[PDB]
Amino acid sequence: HIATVRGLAVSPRHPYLFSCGEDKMVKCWDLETNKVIRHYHGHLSGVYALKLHPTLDVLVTAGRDAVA
RNA sequence: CGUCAAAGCACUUUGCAAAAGCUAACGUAUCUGUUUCUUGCCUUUUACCAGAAACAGCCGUUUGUAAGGUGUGCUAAUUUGACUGUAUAGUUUUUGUAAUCUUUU
């Protein structure tokens, strides 16, 4: 990251780890390889909330865009 | 070559499915891109240098199956499978040593 890693979230169902920040960046750190796989581009500004839905493979994040 | 069974037949157009099952060229061919890292040449970013790992596209190949098209036959031809497939009256099996009678329990 380039600016304070705000969020984090490990998923239990997949060996992934997530992160967020004041970069607009949302990442998918694969835990088996220990590198990033996916960016989730779309957020207009610094993201704070990072939380992983329990059933459905789905990811929720929110920040100052004033939107989840 | 011979029998039996199945089926139109050869050639072709599309659709739809698949293509490491026990280490192996689906392609004796071979190109671009994204991300993550490492080094080059550099300060405008792009455009690039040349290595890695992870993903992707693209140009092609094979198979099965479905419907079609052309030419030929449906009073035929071709394909496909399957099979415990040969002929011997003269000594080891399919051209007879068989026939017949009687006693014992």
Curated annotation (Swiss-Prot):
What compartments host this protein?
Answer: Nucleus
Could you tell me which cysteines form disulfide bridges?
Answer: none
Q: Which residues form a coiled coil?
A: none
Extent of the WD repeats: 1-30, 42-68
Q: What does this protein do?
A: Required for both cell cycle progression at G2/M and pre-mRNA splicing. Interacts genetically with the PRP4 kinase.
Family as reported in the entry's similarity comment = Belongs to the WD repeat PRL1/PRL2 family.
Cite the record's note on assembly: Belongs to the 40S cdc5-associated complex (or cwf complex), a spliceosome sub-complex reminiscent of a late-stage spliceosome composed of the U2, U5 and U6 snRNAs and at least brr2, cdc5, cwf2/prp3, cwf3/syf1, cwf4/syf3, cwf5/ecm2, spp42/cwf6, cwf7/spf27, cwf8, cwf9, cwf10, cwf11, cwf12, prp45/cwf13, cwf14, cwf15, cwf16, cwf17, cwf18, cwf19, cwf20, cwf21, cwf22, cwf23, cwf24, cwf25, cwf26, cyp7/cwf27, cwf28, cwf29/ist3, lea1, msl1, prp5/cwf1, prp10, prp12/sap130, prp17, prp22, sap61, sap62, sap114, sap145, slu7, smb1, smd1, smd3, smf1, smg1 and syf2.
Put simply, this protein is called Pre-mRNA-splicing factor prp5
Which species expresses this protein natively? Answer: Schizosaccharomyces pombe (strain 972 / ATCC 24843)
Q: Which gene encodes it?
A: prp5
What fragment of the full-length protein is this?
A: 204 to 271 of 473
